[PDB]
Design a protein around this ligand. Structure first.
Ligand SMILES: OC[C@H]1O[C@H](O)[C@@H](O)[C@@H](O)[C@@H]1O
Lengths: 279, 205
Protein backbone atom coordinates (compact mmCIF):
# COMPACT_ATOMS: atom_id res chain seq x y z
CA UNK A 1 0.00 0.00 0.00
CA UNK A 2 1.50 3.30 -1.13
CA UNK A 3 0.27 6.78 -2.04
CA UNK A 4 1.40 9.62 -4.28
CA UNK A 5 0.76 13.28 -4.78
CA UNK A 6 -0.58 14.58 -8.08
CA UNK A 7 2.26 17.06 -7.93
CA UNK A 8 4.85 14.32 -7.80
CA UNK A 9 5.71 13.24 -4.22
CA UNK A 10 5.14 9.77 -2.76
CA UNK A 11 4.97 8.08 0.61
CA UNK A 12 6.11 4.47 0.39
CA UNK A 13 5.05 1.17 1.97
CA UNK A 14 5.27 1.53 5.75
CA UNK A 15 4.07 5.11 5.83
CA UNK A 16 5.71 8.50 6.09
CA UNK A 17 4.73 12.02 5.19
CA UNK A 18 4.37 14.45 2.32
CA UNK A 19 3.46 17.99 1.45
CA UNK A 20 0.38 18.71 -0.60
CA UNK A 21 0.34 22.15 -2.29
CA UNK A 22 -3.12 23.62 -3.09
CA UNK A 23 -4.34 26.65 -5.03
CA UNK A 24 -7.51 27.93 -3.34
CA UNK A 25 -10.35 30.24 -4.47
CA UNK A 26 -8.83 33.74 -4.10
CA UNK A 27 -11.99 35.21 -2.54
CA UNK A 28 -14.62 33.72 -0.28
CA UNK A 29 -17.43 35.56 1.49
CA UNK A 30 -18.66 35.14 5.00
CA UNK A 31 -21.33 32.46 4.83
CA UNK A 32 -19.87 30.73 1.76
CA UNK A 33 -17.80 27.54 1.44
CA UNK A 34 -14.12 27.31 0.65
CA UNK A 35 -13.53 23.84 -0.72
CA UNK A 36 -10.23 22.01 -0.58
CA UNK A 37 -10.64 18.79 -2.48
CA UNK A 38 -7.72 16.45 -1.86
CA UNK A 39 -9.30 13.52 -3.74
CA UNK A 40 -7.93 15.46 -6.64
CA UNK A 41 -4.42 15.48 -5.23
CA UNK A 42 -3.87 12.34 -3.17
CA UNK A 43 -3.89 8.81 -4.61
CA UNK A 44 -3.26 5.38 -3.16
CA UNK A 45 -3.27 1.78 -4.39
CA UNK A 46 -3.15 -1.76 -3.02
CA UNK A 47 0.12 -3.55 -3.84
CA UNK A 48 -1.21 -7.10 -3.56
CA UNK A 49 -4.97 -6.84 -4.29
CA UNK A 50 -5.66 -10.52 -5.14
CA UNK A 51 -4.71 -11.71 -1.64
CA UNK A 52 -4.76 -8.62 0.54
CA UNK A 53 -7.48 -6.09 1.21
CA UNK A 54 -6.42 -2.63 2.37
CA UNK A 55 -8.39 -0.39 4.77
CA UNK A 56 -7.86 3.37 4.55
CA UNK A 57 -9.16 5.69 7.25
CA UNK A 58 -9.00 9.44 8.09
CA UNK A 59 -7.23 8.97 11.46
CA UNK A 60 -7.08 12.69 12.29
CA UNK A 61 -7.61 16.08 10.63
CA UNK A 62 -6.12 19.26 12.03
CA UNK A 63 -6.29 22.94 11.19
CA UNK A 64 -3.51 25.54 11.22
CA UNK A 65 -3.02 29.27 10.79
CA UNK A 66 -5.94 31.05 9.23
CA UNK A 67 -7.97 27.91 8.76
CA UNK A 68 -7.89 27.51 12.51
CA UNK A 69 -8.83 31.05 13.46
CA UNK A 70 -11.08 32.20 10.62
CA UNK A 71 -13.13 29.17 9.68
CA UNK A 72 -15.61 26.60 10.92
CA UNK A 73 -15.87 23.49 8.86
CA UNK A 74 -16.47 19.90 8.03
CA UNK A 75 -14.51 17.13 6.40
CA UNK A 76 -16.24 15.00 3.81
CA UNK A 77 -14.67 11.54 3.81
CA UNK A 78 -16.06 9.09 1.28
CA UNK A 79 -19.58 10.45 1.11
CA UNK A 80 -19.98 11.32 4.81
CA UNK A 81 -19.16 14.50 6.77
CA UNK A 82 -17.51 15.10 10.09
CA UNK A 83 -16.42 18.04 12.26
CA UNK A 84 -13.10 19.59 11.22
CA UNK A 85 -10.78 19.82 13.12
CA UNK A 86 -11.67 16.15 13.49
CA UNK A 87 -12.69 14.56 16.79
CA UNK A 88 -12.71 10.83 16.03
CA UNK A 89 -11.08 8.34 13.69
CA UNK A 90 -13.31 8.05 10.66
CA UNK A 91 -14.89 4.85 9.25
CA UNK A 92 -12.73 2.70 6.93
CA UNK A 93 -12.73 2.74 3.11
CA UNK A 94 -11.23 -0.16 1.16
CA UNK A 95 -8.57 -0.19 -1.50
CA UNK A 96 -8.31 -3.27 -3.70
CA UNK A 97 -6.44 -2.47 -6.85
CA UNK A 98 -2.93 -1.70 -7.98
CA UNK A 99 -4.63 1.13 -9.81
CA UNK A 100 -4.28 4.53 -8.14
CA UNK A 101 -7.65 5.38 -6.63
CA UNK A 102 -8.30 8.77 -4.99
CA UNK A 103 -8.44 9.34 -1.25
CA UNK A 104 -11.97 10.90 -1.01
CA UNK A 105 -11.28 13.73 1.39
CA UNK A 106 -12.45 17.30 1.06
CA UNK A 107 -12.41 20.26 3.42
CA UNK A 108 -15.50 22.47 3.47
CA UNK A 109 -14.54 25.74 5.11
CA UNK A 110 -16.77 28.76 5.81
CA UNK A 111 -15.26 32.08 6.96
CA UNK A 112 -16.51 33.56 10.20
CA UNK A 113 -18.10 37.00 10.30
CA UNK A 114 -14.96 38.21 12.05
CA UNK A 115 -12.68 37.01 9.26
CA UNK A 116 -10.30 39.81 8.23
CA UNK A 117 -9.26 40.33 4.64
CA UNK A 118 -6.54 37.72 4.20
CA UNK A 119 -7.93 34.74 6.14
CA UNK A 120 -5.23 32.35 4.83
CA UNK A 121 -1.64 33.30 3.96
CA UNK A 122 0.04 32.24 0.75
CA UNK A 123 2.53 29.52 1.67
CA UNK A 124 0.99 28.66 5.03
CA UNK A 125 0.34 25.31 6.65
CA UNK A 126 -3.38 25.09 6.28
CA UNK A 127 -3.97 21.53 7.49
CA UNK A 128 -2.45 18.20 8.44
CA UNK A 129 -4.34 15.03 7.45
CA UNK A 130 -3.46 11.61 8.78
CA UNK A 131 -4.27 8.63 6.62
CA UNK A 132 -4.26 5.35 8.54
CA UNK A 133 -3.96 2.10 6.59
CA UNK A 134 -4.36 -1.45 7.85
CA UNK A 135 -5.41 -4.70 6.16
CA UNK A 136 -7.08 -8.08 6.44
CA UNK A 137 -3.70 -9.78 6.29
CA UNK A 138 -1.58 -8.85 9.32
CA UNK A 139 -0.82 -6.34 12.06
CA UNK A 140 0.22 -3.59 9.60
CA UNK A 141 -0.92 -0.20 10.92
CA UNK A 142 0.85 2.59 9.01
CA UNK A 143 0.28 6.33 8.93
CA UNK A 144 0.52 8.53 5.88
CA UNK A 145 0.78 12.15 6.93
CA UNK A 146 -0.27 14.86 4.51
CA UNK A 147 0.79 18.45 5.20
CA UNK A 148 -1.54 20.75 3.27
CA UNK A 149 -0.06 24.12 2.30
CA UNK A 150 -1.95 26.94 0.55
CA UNK A 151 -0.15 28.45 -2.45
CA UNK A 152 -2.05 31.69 -2.33
CA UNK A 153 -3.94 34.10 -0.09
CA UNK A 154 -7.63 33.43 0.44
CA UNK A 155 -9.29 36.82 1.04
CA UNK A 156 -12.68 37.16 2.74
CA UNK A 157 -14.22 40.53 1.73
CA UNK A 158 -15.30 42.85 4.50
CA UNK A 159 -19.09 43.09 4.87
CA UNK A 160 -21.41 45.99 5.56
CA UNK A 161 -22.38 46.94 9.11
CA UNK A 162 -25.70 46.34 10.87
CA UNK A 163 -27.91 49.24 11.82
CA UNK A 164 -29.72 47.95 14.87
CA UNK A 165 -32.97 49.94 15.06
CA UNK A 166 -36.03 49.15 17.21
CA UNK A 167 -38.78 50.33 14.78
CA UNK A 168 -41.36 53.01 13.85
CA UNK A 169 -40.78 55.45 16.71
CA UNK A 170 -43.91 57.02 18.13
CA UNK A 171 -42.91 60.69 18.18
CA UNK A 172 -46.00 60.98 20.36
CA UNK A 173 -44.51 63.35 22.97
CA UNK A 174 -47.31 65.82 22.22
CA UNK A 175 -46.40 68.81 20.09
CA UNK A 176 -43.73 70.24 22.32
CA UNK A 177 -42.21 66.90 23.37
CA UNK A 178 -39.04 65.22 22.14
CA UNK A 179 -37.87 61.61 22.41
CA UNK A 180 -34.49 59.89 22.02
CA UNK A 181 -34.09 57.71 18.93
CA UNK A 182 -32.62 54.27 19.53
CA UNK A 183 -30.25 53.64 16.66
CA UNK A 184 -26.87 51.96 16.91
CA UNK A 185 -24.52 50.33 14.44
CA UNK A 186 -21.95 47.60 14.81
CA UNK A 187 -19.54 46.11 12.31
CA UNK A 188 -18.11 42.57 12.31
CA UNK A 189 -14.93 44.29 11.14
CA UNK A 190 -14.07 47.76 12.43
CA UNK A 191 -14.30 50.51 9.81
CA UNK A 192 -15.04 54.20 9.38
CA UNK A 193 -18.67 55.11 8.88
CA UNK A 194 -20.42 58.37 8.23
CA UNK A 195 -24.08 59.17 7.73
CA UNK A 196 -26.45 61.80 6.41
CA UNK A 197 -30.18 62.41 6.43
CA UNK A 198 -32.39 62.82 3.39
CA UNK A 199 -35.98 63.79 2.78
CA UNK A 200 -38.38 66.62 2.01
CA UNK A 201 -37.56 69.73 3.99
CA UNK A 202 -39.66 72.70 5.05
CA UNK A 203 -37.06 75.35 5.86
CA UNK A 204 -34.22 77.35 4.36
CA UNK A 205 -31.83 75.70 6.81
CA UNK A 206 -33.01 72.48 5.26
CA UNK A 207 -33.24 70.70 8.62
CA UNK A 208 -36.96 70.49 9.51
CA UNK A 209 -38.58 67.51 7.86
CA UNK A 210 -41.95 68.19 6.30
CA UNK A 211 -45.05 66.83 8.00
CA UNK A 212 -46.29 63.86 6.03
CA UNK A 213 -49.66 62.55 7.17
CA UNK A 214 -53.34 62.60 6.25
CA UNK A 215 -55.43 62.50 9.47
CA UNK A 216 -55.99 66.24 9.95
CA UNK A 217 -52.40 67.41 9.34
CA UNK A 218 -51.39 69.23 12.50
CA UNK A 219 -50.16 72.09 10.33
CA UNK A 220 -47.22 74.35 11.14
CA UNK A 221 -44.85 71.91 12.81
CA UNK A 222 -42.49 69.27 11.40
CA UNK A 223 -39.86 66.84 12.73
CA UNK A 224 -36.20 67.81 13.32
CA UNK A 225 -33.47 65.41 14.39
CA UNK A 226 -30.74 66.22 16.81
CA UNK A 227 -27.56 64.39 17.96
CA UNK A 228 -26.74 65.31 21.57
CA UNK A 229 -28.11 68.79 21.01
CA UNK A 230 -26.62 69.36 17.56
CA UNK A 231 -29.06 69.76 14.70
CA UNK A 232 -28.66 67.46 11.74
CA UNK A 233 -29.67 69.14 8.48
CA UNK A 234 -30.41 66.89 5.48
CA UNK A 235 -27.35 65.91 3.43
CA UNK A 236 -24.78 66.95 6.04
CA UNK A 237 -22.47 64.01 6.56
CA UNK A 238 -21.91 63.16 10.20
CA UNK A 239 -18.72 61.24 10.79
CA UNK A 240 -19.07 58.35 13.22
CA UNK A 241 -15.35 57.54 13.25
CA UNK A 242 -14.40 53.88 13.66
CA UNK A 243 -17.26 51.54 14.43
CA UNK A 244 -16.53 48.01 15.54
CA UNK A 245 -18.00 45.04 17.37
CA UNK A 246 -19.46 47.21 20.12
CA UNK A 247 -22.55 49.05 18.90
CA UNK A 248 -22.33 52.82 18.59
CA UNK A 249 -25.37 54.95 19.35
CA UNK A 250 -25.86 57.86 16.94
CA UNK A 251 -27.42 59.63 19.90
CA UNK A 252 -30.44 60.79 17.95
CA UNK A 253 -33.50 62.60 19.26
CA UNK A 254 -36.62 63.52 17.34
CA UNK A 255 -37.72 67.13 17.94
CA UNK A 256 -40.66 69.18 16.76
CA UNK A 257 -39.62 72.41 15.02
CA UNK A 258 -41.86 75.13 13.64
CA UNK A 259 -42.05 75.66 9.90
CA UNK A 260 -44.52 78.35 8.94
CA UNK A 261 -46.27 80.37 11.62
CA UNK A 262 -49.57 79.38 13.21
CA UNK A 263 -49.26 75.88 14.65
CA UNK A 264 -52.40 73.78 14.42
CA UNK A 265 -53.86 70.67 16.05
CA UNK A 266 -53.72 67.31 14.31
CA UNK A 267 -51.31 64.52 13.47
CA UNK A 268 -47.64 64.93 12.61
CA UNK A 269 -45.99 62.07 10.73
CA UNK A 270 -42.70 61.85 8.87
CA UNK A 271 -40.31 59.60 6.96
CA UNK A 272 -36.58 60.26 7.00
CA UNK A 273 -33.79 58.47 5.24
CA UNK A 274 -30.60 57.70 7.10
CA UNK A 275 -27.76 56.89 4.72
CA UNK A 276 -24.63 55.25 6.09
CA UNK A 277 -21.63 55.95 3.89
CA UNK A 278 -18.87 53.35 3.68
CA UNK A 279 -15.23 54.22 3.25
CA UNK B 1 -31.34 45.20 10.20
CA UNK B 2 -30.56 44.98 6.50
CA UNK B 3 -26.91 44.74 5.46
CA UNK B 4 -24.94 44.62 2.25
CA UNK B 5 -22.37 41.84 1.80
CA UNK B 6 -19.62 44.20 0.63
CA UNK B 7 -18.46 47.72 1.41
CA UNK B 8 -17.74 48.38 -2.25
CA UNK B 9 -18.14 46.91 -5.70
CA UNK B 10 -15.75 46.58 -8.59
CA UNK B 11 -17.49 46.57 -11.95
CA UNK B 12 -15.16 44.99 -14.57
CA UNK B 13 -15.66 46.78 -17.87
CA UNK B 14 -17.31 44.27 -20.17
CA UNK B 15 -19.04 42.11 -17.57
CA UNK B 16 -22.71 41.82 -18.40
CA UNK B 17 -23.46 42.18 -14.70
CA UNK B 18 -21.99 42.09 -11.20
CA UNK B 19 -23.84 40.90 -8.13
CA UNK B 20 -24.04 42.05 -4.53
CA UNK B 21 -25.54 40.27 -1.51
CA UNK B 22 -28.14 41.65 0.82
CA UNK B 23 -29.20 40.02 4.00
CA UNK B 24 -31.98 40.95 6.43
CA UNK B 25 -31.23 40.12 10.09
CA UNK B 26 -34.49 41.15 11.72
CA UNK B 27 -36.12 37.81 12.35
CA UNK B 28 -39.46 39.55 12.02
CA UNK B 29 -40.18 42.64 9.96
CA UNK B 30 -40.54 42.80 6.19
CA UNK B 31 -38.67 45.31 4.05
CA UNK B 32 -38.87 46.75 0.57
CA UNK B 33 -35.49 46.86 -1.03
CA UNK B 34 -35.05 49.70 -3.49
CA UNK B 35 -31.63 50.08 -5.07
CA UNK B 36 -30.02 52.53 -7.48
CA UNK B 37 -26.72 53.99 -8.56
CA UNK B 38 -25.82 57.66 -8.67
CA UNK B 39 -22.79 58.94 -10.51
CA UNK B 40 -19.88 60.83 -8.99
CA UNK B 41 -21.86 64.03 -8.91
CA UNK B 42 -24.68 62.38 -7.00
CA UNK B 43 -27.12 62.43 -9.87
CA UNK B 44 -29.21 59.40 -10.79
CA UNK B 45 -28.25 58.94 -14.42
CA UNK B 46 -28.87 55.50 -15.79
CA UNK B 47 -25.27 54.47 -16.19
CA UNK B 48 -25.97 51.48 -13.99
CA UNK B 49 -29.16 49.61 -13.17
CA UNK B 50 -29.84 47.28 -10.29
CA UNK B 51 -32.34 44.44 -10.22
CA UNK B 52 -34.66 43.73 -8.87
CA UNK B 53 -35.29 47.47 -8.61
CA UNK B 54 -37.84 46.76 -5.85
CA UNK B 55 -38.58 43.65 -3.80
CA UNK B 56 -39.46 42.34 -0.37
CA UNK B 57 -37.34 40.56 2.22
CA UNK B 58 -39.49 38.92 4.86
CA UNK B 59 -37.75 38.02 8.10
CA UNK B 60 -34.22 36.60 8.11
CA UNK B 61 -33.61 36.14 4.40
CA UNK B 62 -30.79 36.52 1.90
CA UNK B 63 -31.07 37.59 -1.72
CA UNK B 64 -28.91 38.82 -4.52
CA UNK B 65 -28.76 42.21 -6.16
CA UNK B 66 -27.41 42.30 -9.73
CA UNK B 67 -25.81 45.46 -11.10
CA UNK B 68 -26.21 45.96 -14.83
CA UNK B 69 -24.00 48.06 -17.05
CA UNK B 70 -26.20 50.47 -18.98
CA UNK B 71 -23.31 52.74 -19.91
CA UNK B 72 -22.51 51.66 -23.46
CA UNK B 73 -18.75 51.98 -22.89
CA UNK B 74 -19.37 55.75 -22.91
CA UNK B 75 -17.02 56.12 -19.94
CA UNK B 76 -13.27 56.87 -19.88
CA UNK B 77 -11.28 53.70 -20.69
CA UNK B 78 -7.93 54.63 -19.15
CA UNK B 79 -9.11 54.97 -15.55
CA UNK B 80 -11.85 53.89 -13.18
CA UNK B 81 -14.98 56.00 -12.94
CA UNK B 82 -16.51 56.63 -9.52
CA UNK B 83 -20.14 55.73 -8.85
CA UNK B 84 -22.33 55.25 -5.81
CA UNK B 85 -24.44 52.21 -5.06
CA UNK B 86 -27.47 52.76 -2.79
CA UNK B 87 -29.69 50.11 -1.16
CA UNK B 88 -32.67 51.42 0.77
CA UNK B 89 -34.64 49.37 3.27
CA UNK B 90 -38.26 50.48 3.28
CA UNK B 91 -40.24 49.43 6.34
CA UNK B 92 -44.03 49.20 6.37
CA UNK B 93 -46.74 51.48 7.79
CA UNK B 94 -48.13 50.33 11.15
CA UNK B 95 -51.90 50.44 10.85
CA UNK B 96 -51.40 50.43 14.62
CA UNK B 97 -49.86 53.89 15.16
CA UNK B 98 -52.01 55.39 12.40
CA UNK B 99 -53.75 58.06 14.56
CA UNK B 100 -50.47 58.84 16.29
CA UNK B 101 -47.60 61.24 15.79
CA UNK B 102 -44.89 59.05 14.33
CA UNK B 103 -41.41 59.05 12.84
CA UNK B 104 -40.15 56.34 10.56
CA UNK B 105 -36.60 55.86 9.40
CA UNK B 106 -35.44 54.19 6.20
CA UNK B 107 -31.90 52.92 6.43
CA UNK B 108 -29.83 53.05 3.28
CA UNK B 109 -26.39 51.60 2.56
CA UNK B 110 -24.36 53.64 0.08
CA UNK B 111 -21.12 52.18 -1.22
CA UNK B 112 -18.60 53.01 -3.91
CA UNK B 113 -18.89 51.24 -7.23
CA UNK B 114 -15.90 51.49 -9.54
CA UNK B 115 -16.16 50.95 -13.26
CA UNK B 116 -12.72 49.45 -13.92
CA UNK B 117 -11.76 49.51 -17.61
CA UNK B 118 -10.56 45.93 -17.95
CA UNK B 119 -7.39 46.68 -19.95
CA UNK B 120 -5.11 48.66 -17.61
CA UNK B 121 -1.40 47.99 -17.10
CA UNK B 122 -0.65 48.77 -13.48
CA UNK B 123 -2.30 45.95 -11.48
CA UNK B 124 -4.47 47.19 -8.52
CA UNK B 125 -2.19 45.53 -5.97
CA UNK B 126 0.62 47.74 -7.25
CA UNK B 127 -1.20 51.07 -6.74
CA UNK B 128 -0.85 52.23 -3.12
CA UNK B 129 2.95 52.37 -3.52
CA UNK B 130 2.67 54.79 -6.44
CA UNK B 131 1.25 57.30 -3.96
CA UNK B 132 3.57 60.29 -3.71
CA UNK B 133 3.12 63.53 -1.75
CA UNK B 134 3.84 67.25 -1.34
CA UNK B 135 3.94 68.43 2.26
CA UNK B 136 3.92 72.12 3.17
CA UNK B 137 3.15 73.51 6.64
CA UNK B 138 -0.59 73.38 5.99
CA UNK B 139 -1.20 71.88 2.56
CA UNK B 140 -0.16 68.22 2.18
CA UNK B 141 -1.29 67.12 -1.27
CA UNK B 142 -1.89 63.38 -1.80
CA UNK B 143 -0.96 62.64 -5.41
CA UNK B 144 -2.15 59.57 -7.32
CA UNK B 145 -0.82 58.93 -10.88
CA UNK B 146 -2.31 55.45 -11.24
CA UNK B 147 -5.72 54.82 -12.82
CA UNK B 148 -7.46 53.70 -9.62
CA UNK B 149 -9.26 55.56 -6.87
CA UNK B 150 -7.05 55.51 -3.81
CA UNK B 151 -8.90 55.33 -0.53
CA UNK B 152 -6.12 56.65 1.69
CA UNK B 153 -6.83 56.00 5.36
CA UNK B 154 -4.81 56.05 8.62
CA UNK B 155 -2.69 58.87 7.21
CA UNK B 156 -0.14 60.46 9.54
CA UNK B 157 2.34 63.33 9.37
CA UNK B 158 4.61 60.92 11.19
CA UNK B 159 2.98 61.20 14.61
CA UNK B 160 0.02 63.46 13.98
CA UNK B 161 -3.06 61.65 12.69
CA UNK B 162 -4.88 63.22 9.75
CA UNK B 163 -8.19 62.90 7.93
CA UNK B 164 -8.84 60.14 5.38
CA UNK B 165 -8.68 60.94 1.70
CA UNK B 166 -9.99 59.63 -1.60
CA UNK B 167 -7.48 60.31 -4.33
CA UNK B 168 -8.86 60.20 -7.89
CA UNK B 169 -7.10 58.41 -10.80
CA UNK B 170 -4.32 60.43 -12.41
CA UNK B 171 -5.40 63.17 -10.05
CA UNK B 172 -4.73 64.49 -6.57
CA UNK B 173 -6.22 65.75 -3.31
CA UNK B 174 -4.93 68.04 -0.58
CA UNK B 175 -5.54 67.19 3.08
CA UNK B 176 -5.08 70.08 5.52
CA UNK B 177 -1.49 69.72 6.82
CA UNK B 178 -1.59 70.46 10.63
CA UNK B 179 2.10 71.46 10.93
CA UNK B 180 2.42 69.22 14.04
CA UNK B 181 4.18 67.62 11.10
CA UNK B 182 7.21 65.46 10.51
CA UNK B 183 7.65 64.07 7.00
CA UNK B 184 7.38 60.56 8.33
CA UNK B 185 4.19 60.55 6.32
CA UNK B 186 2.46 57.22 6.93
CA UNK B 187 -0.61 55.63 5.36
CA UNK B 188 -2.52 52.45 4.61
CA UNK B 189 -5.29 52.14 2.01
CA UNK B 190 -8.45 50.20 1.27
CA UNK B 191 -8.35 47.51 -1.40
CA UNK B 192 -10.99 45.95 -3.59
CA UNK B 193 -11.96 43.75 -0.66
CA UNK B 194 -12.46 46.61 1.69
CA UNK B 195 -9.31 45.40 3.36
CA UNK B 196 -6.52 47.60 4.76
CA UNK B 197 -3.33 47.35 2.75
CA UNK B 198 -0.07 47.24 4.71
CA UNK B 199 1.28 50.49 6.18
CA UNK B 200 3.67 52.25 3.80
CA UNK B 201 5.94 55.28 4.13
CA UNK B 202 5.16 58.65 2.62
CA UNK B 203 7.38 59.42 -0.36
CA UNK B 204 7.05 63.13 -1.24
CA UNK B 205 7.38 63.75 -4.98
O1 LIG C 1 -1.06 -3.36 -0.39
C1 LIG C 1 -1.12 -4.56 0.37
C2 LIG C 1 0.03 -4.65 1.33
O2 LIG C 1 1.20 -4.13 0.65
C3 LIG C 1 2.40 -4.17 1.46
O3 LIG C 1 2.63 -5.48 1.82
C4 LIG C 1 2.20 -3.35 2.74
O4 LIG C 1 2.00 -1.99 2.41
C5 LIG C 1 1.00 -3.88 3.51
O5 LIG C 1 0.76 -3.10 4.67
C6 LIG C 1 -0.23 -3.86 2.61
O6 LIG C 1 -1.32 -4.43 3.31
Amino acid sequence: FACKTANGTAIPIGGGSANVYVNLAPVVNVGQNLVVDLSTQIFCHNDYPETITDYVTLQRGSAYGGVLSNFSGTVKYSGSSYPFPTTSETPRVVYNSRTDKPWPVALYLTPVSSAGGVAIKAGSLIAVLILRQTNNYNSDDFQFVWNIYANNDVVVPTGGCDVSARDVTVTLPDYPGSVPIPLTVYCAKSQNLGYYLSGTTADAGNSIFTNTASFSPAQGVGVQLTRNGTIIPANNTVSLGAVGTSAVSLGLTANYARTGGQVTAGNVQSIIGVTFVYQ
Amino acid sequence: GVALGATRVIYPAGQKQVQLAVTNNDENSTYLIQSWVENADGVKDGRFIVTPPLFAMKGKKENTLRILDATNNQLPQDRESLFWMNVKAIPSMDKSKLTENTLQLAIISRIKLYYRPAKLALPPDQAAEKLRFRRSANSLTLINPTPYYLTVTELNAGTRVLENALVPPMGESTVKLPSDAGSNITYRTINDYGALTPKMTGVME
